[PDB]
Symmetry: C5
Subunit: 30 residues, 5 copies
Amino acid sequence: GNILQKIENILKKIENILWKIENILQKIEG
Amino acid sequence: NILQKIENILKKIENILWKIENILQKIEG
Amino acid sequence: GNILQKIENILKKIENILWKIENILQKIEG
Amino acid sequence: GNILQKIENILKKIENILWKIENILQKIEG
Amino acid sequence: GNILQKIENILKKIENILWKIENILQKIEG
């Protein structure tokens, strides 16, 4: 129930961190 | 549904990782 | 749909992409 | 300790590793 | 094993690959 909500929330955080990594790499390569 | 949302976020994560992978291919280039 | 099978399939692709990333990074570090 | 909790723990570990990777890159780009 | 265990196992592989990636980056300050 709420554990699925915890899993969803962690995946959103993972997504957000990956976006940050992508942006740093884009600036480096750009 | 929560399972569909989880699936949707994972698809987004896959897409971001593809972008990261292509950028690294360029950097290693 | 079969949401759990879709989730499994997406995770397999994520694994594959990450393995490619690790290999590219190995070359960069070399 | 059910399978969902185990999955949650692994995702939390993934999140933390990604944070570390981002933290290192933030330094590299300066 | 069942579908949730298959998913857990793929997540473990993802974690492990990310740890490898992190390991390479950690060397710079380490």
